[PDB]
Design a protein around this ligand. Structure first.
Ligand SMILES: CN1c2c(O)nc(N)nc2NC[C@@H]1CNc1ccc(C(=O)N[C@@H](CCC(=O)O)C(=O)O)cc1
Length: 407
């Protein structure tokens, strides 16, 4: 056992690493960079040969990372997420082939699988009497870092007048700094599943079928599997659609970072406003899902049918409201699933729901989006995503009536 770190030097460093690990100013401007005059990629190569590999590689690495997150005690995977972000921005700046960007999506899928490597790091690092204050400060440092990277990426592009290549070298400097900050993180001695000194598995399975027959876990897991698979299929491809609506030559008029900083600012407001709604609106739960999914059905339809370049701000508003609609139902889903679950059980169910949502996301993106399937453009596949939410909101509205008139 090593020497214990100072407490104020620990929380001010977890909230500084969790702030600096989100600083990727050129993250919202990857698609205007790939579809720009610096990359030599067709519009049909980005939406049908590169971006479906993001959902393929996410399915392949979600279970290896989630096991390696708990086996390696959450410090090498926070380093793997930092080194895969450098490998994304090294393949952005030095990659020219389509296979160089399919590899880039492979490295970005490692970082998306390691998004829980920081939320579960401070869970095992901090004692439970001190955890909810540190998890409040950390989460408010993550969503401040996600906000201020899109603001810094927008101010460098619009006000600063830098190119997308220069912005990705600025983003590469903020990402090598996040690798150095991940080296000085205190590794925990025991983990939640594998490193525990002790069975854990036996207990889990035995305490699962009791919790599997809960009408709120079984309802919101089906939301997490299907209504979140269609969510991320919009977020992957909305930057390809914004490059089609307003195909500007000047990089300073792109405003992808202002539309992803506002969706983070609205995503933090609706997630805060959901915390006073998790319990008192849990009875009218299928009607809340069917009301938001039908709202997401109209916003994705509004994205797919705005064709004039002057209505690019309507496409920016129909995605800030789309991310605000989804991030409203995430604290309600996180509460109603993990209410009567253990911490080992809630880590399993949220990992299984994210895995099953990645199977649905892979099945749709192979049929609808991939060139080996249909090979649809981003407008004709956003019309299929619009009727995907409309099919889902009708199923939840029938469930809010065929289980709502039985009283
Ligand atoms: C970088 N960006 C991108 C892009 O713009 N264009 C292509 N072709 N490929 C890619 N690769 C990945 C990424 C677009 N795909 C994603 C994938 C995942 C997220 C994501 O984790 N969103 C989180 C919020 C975290 C955040 O704000 O980044 C959410 O819960 O909605 C957001 C966008």
């Amino acid at each position: 056992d090593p020497e214990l770190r100072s407490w104020r030097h620990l929380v001010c460093y977890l909230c500084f690493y969790g702030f600096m690990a989100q600083i990727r100013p050129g993250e919202s401007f990857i698609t205007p960079y790939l579809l720009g005059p610096d990359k030599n990629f067709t519009r049909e190569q980005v939406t049908n040969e590169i971006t479906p590999v993001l959902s393929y590689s996410y399915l392949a690495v979600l279970v290896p990372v989630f096991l390696l997150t708990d086996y390696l005690r959450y410090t090498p995977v926070l380093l793997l997420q930092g080194l895969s972000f450098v490998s994304v921005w090294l393949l952005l700046l030095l990659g020219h082939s389509v296979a160089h960007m399919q590899l880039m999506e492979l490295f970005y899928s490692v970082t998306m699988a390691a998004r829980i490597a920081y939320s579960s790091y401070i869970f095992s690092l901090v004692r439970p009497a001190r955890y909810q204050r540190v998890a409040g400060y950390s989460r408010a440092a993550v969503l401040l870092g996600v906000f201020t990277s899109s603001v810094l990426g927008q101010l460098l592009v619009t006000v600063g007048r830098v190119s997308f290549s220069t912005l990705n070298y600025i983003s590469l400097a903020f990402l090598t700094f996040s690798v150095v900050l991940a080296l000085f993180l205190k590794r925990p001695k025991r983990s939640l599943f594998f490193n525990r000194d002790d069975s854990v598995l036996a207990r889990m399975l035995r305490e699962l079928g009791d919790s599997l027959r809960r009408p709120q876990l079984r309802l919101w897991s089906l939301w997490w599997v299907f209504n979140s698979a269609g969510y991320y299929l919009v977020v992957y491809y909305v930057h390809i659609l914004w490059n089609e609506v307003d195909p500007t030559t000047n990089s300073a008029r792109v405003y992808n970072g202002a539309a992803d900083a506002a969706s983070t600012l609205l995503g933090a407001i609706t997630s805060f406003a959901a915390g006073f709604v998790k319990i008192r609106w849990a009875r009218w739960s299928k009607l809340l899902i069917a009301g938001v999914t039908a709202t997401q059905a109209g916003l994705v339809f509004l994205l797919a049918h705005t064709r004039h370049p002057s209505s690019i701000w309507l496409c920016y508003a129909a995605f800030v409201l789309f991310r605000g609609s989804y991030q409203f139902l995430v604290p309600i889903a996180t509460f109603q699933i993990a209410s009567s679950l253990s911490k080992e059980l809630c880590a399993l169910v949220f990992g299984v729901n994210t895995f099953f949502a990645t199977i649905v996301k892979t099945i749709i993106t192979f049929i609808v989006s991939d060139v080996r399937g249909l090979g649809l453009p981003v407008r004709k596949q956003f019309q299929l995503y619009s009727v995907y939410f409309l099919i889902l909101s009708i199923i939840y509205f029938l469930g809010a009536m065929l289980d709502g008139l039985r009283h």
